[PDB]
Design an enzyme around this catalytic site. Structure first.
Site, PDB file in Angstrom:
ATOM      1  N   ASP A  21     -19.759  -0.963  -2.081  1.00  0.00           N
ATOM      2  CA  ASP A  21     -19.163  -2.057  -1.598  1.00  0.00           C
ATOM      3  C   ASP A  21     -19.680  -2.494  -0.274  1.00  0.00           C
ATOM      4  OD1 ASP A  21     -18.118  -0.592   0.479  1.00  0.00           O
ATOM      5  OD2 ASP A  21     -15.717  -1.006  -1.017  1.00  0.00           O
ATOM      6  N   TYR A  25       1.242  -1.102   0.033  1.00  0.00           N
ATOM      7  CA  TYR A  25       0.322  -0.072  -0.183  1.00  0.00           C
ATOM      8  C   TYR A  25       0.694   0.917  -0.066  1.00  0.00           C
ATOM      9  CZ  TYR A  25      -4.463  -2.305   0.580  1.00  0.00           C
ATOM     10  OH  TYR A  25      -5.682  -2.718   0.412  1.00  0.00           O
TER      11      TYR A  25
HETATM   12 MN   LIG Z   1     -12.441  -2.178  -2.618  1.00  0.00          MN
HETATM   13 MN   LIG Z   2     -14.364  -0.653   0.332  1.00  0.00          MN
END
Ligand SMILES: [Mn+2]
Ligand SMILES: [Mn+2]
Ligand SMILES: [Mn+2]
Ligand SMILES: [Mn+2]
Ligand SMILES: [Mn+2]
Ligand SMILES: [Mn+2]
Ligand SMILES: [Mn+2]
Ligand SMILES: [Mn+2]
Lengths: 284, 283
Positions: A115, A89
């Site tokens: 999501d 990341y």
């Molecule tokens: Mn995602």
């Molecule tokens: Mn997300």
């Protein structure tokens, strides 16, 4: 004061990190206020993933008090792969509590359902964060990722304690002081699951980083979605554990849940398979 | 077999890593053969710095048997800073033993004296290496870095155990399988010390990575320079410790040097100051 309670060894299925308020576990999803200072636009970020790491640590929706655990795929611990030129990341990565990307309506900006999680936060400051940290951040802008066809906004934020924070007020300031970071962010979220066999992702608005005010508006919408969720009024809460210890007017308030969490049992980090070292040279 | 002998904690002033052969310390500079397989040009690389780390570990010229020790600055440890979009070192970084960038003569390719050290190696395979590792590598090419005004060649190589090693045979294969890595390598060595106040570096040949044939010739020259050095026949060895335990015809051969090294005393890694986290944007 917020602290952490770790159970087990990092990089194992048994690892959990709970957030404690004055020594007592609370829900990392529901009990940490979104706002540290509402009218100055200062937010509490829950950190999941330190910059330049791979383990895909998340606030878990389906366990009581929503500890941070490692995500899994096909029964296996999930590690995001290294995609050149990036190492793991490229932000301290986490979420705003008391927010929800509602999966039960199509969001007009993006034309896709949410999501089903807390809104996501990219914290760009110099210091590497720690899992379960609660830090105070200012929002600078927001990007409209469509992640596997779902609305998955990414807020761009900075720790108010960063030496540069006073100089960063809106999204144009990110390019000034962090030149190339926003472009690298767009690339990262497009390509990071290609090594897993997934398609490239896409952004709305041709990848534009919308400004601070836009960011605040979307954050506030996701906070309203959470208000409905925690009140028990979603058409489908998706099995999210809504247990909380600080919201006494909600149906799932429970004082007892905090004391039912086991005590810390912090063990040394477990090894990570050497395959996670690999640098993938991929692109859309 | 080669193994390591660690003294102290990583990220301290007391940290040392010696290389052992059959359990006995040898010089990391002089006693490890340049070639693992001379007919096939397979080299032994001594690893100093794992990919994606900061601590500026080096084979030290100034200590007997040339252990790997962290460079120091102003009484503290030296770390290379993170320069966006890079995290620390972007290669497994080290050297070929039995080589020397001669500081007493100007090199014609680069029109500068050598940097007084073994020739440097960038190992581009998937696995992160460990300090004091001796790995066997194929040479792919070479870049002519002028580092603060000195000849400071960087060999591009791959561990023979890497899954891609069979497909990596010359420098063009690096772009074929690792697109963008050579360009990033040029940038990295140009800018990495600007946060420390240094001027930007430069490359000869406009930063071109020369091919394997060219690299073999430069490596050979640096090996010949080391053969002069270790024979005591340089005009000026710059105070380098030339003590060795495997070259009995050299004036500085001394097998007892091995027996003088203390036993391992490995301690857990020490913490690194959080300032080293910082990402510098040097455009
Ligand atoms: Mn995602
Ligand atoms: Mn997300
Ligand atoms: Mn997820
Ligand atoms: Mn998330
Ligand atoms: Mn040096
Ligand atoms: Mn060197
Ligand atoms: Mn140099
Ligand atoms: Mn050098």
């Amino acid at each position: 004061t917020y602290t952490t309670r770790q159970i087990g060894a990092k990089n194992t299925l048994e690892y959990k990190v709970y957030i404690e308020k004055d020594g007592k576990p609370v829900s990392a999803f529901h009990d940490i206020p979104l706002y540290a200072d509402k009218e100055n636009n200062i937010f509490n970020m829950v950190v999941e993933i330190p910059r330049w790491t791979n383990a895909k640590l998340e606030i878990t929706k389906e366990e009581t008090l929503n500890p941070i655990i490692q995500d899994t795929k096909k029964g296996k611990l999930r590690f995001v792969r290294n995609c050149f030129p990036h190492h793991g990341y490229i932000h301290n990565y986490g979420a705003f509590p008391q927010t929800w990307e509602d999966p039960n309506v199509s969001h007009p900006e993006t034309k896709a359902v949410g999501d089903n999680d807390p809104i996501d936060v990219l914290e760009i400051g110099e210091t590497i964060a720690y899992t379960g940290q609660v830090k105070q951040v200012k929002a600078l802008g927001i990007m409209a990722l469509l992640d596997e066809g779902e609305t998955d906004w990414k807020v761009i934020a900075i720790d108010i304690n960063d030496p540069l924070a006073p100089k960063l007020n809106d999204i144009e300031d990110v390019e000034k002081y962090f030149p190339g970071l926003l472009r690298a962010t767009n690339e990262w979220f497009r390509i990071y699951k290609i090594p897993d066999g997934k398609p490239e992702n896409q952004f709305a608005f041709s990848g534009e980083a919308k400004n601070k005010k836009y960011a605040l508006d979307i954050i506030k919408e996701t906070h309203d979605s959470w208000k409905q969720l925690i009140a028990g009024k979603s058409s489908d809460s998706k099995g999210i554990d809504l247990t909380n210890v600080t919201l006494p007017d909600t149906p799932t308030y429970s004082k007892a849940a905090s004391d039912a969490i086991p005590p810390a049992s912090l063990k040394a980090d477990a090894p990570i398979d050497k395959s996670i070292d690999k640098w993938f040279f991929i692109s859309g």
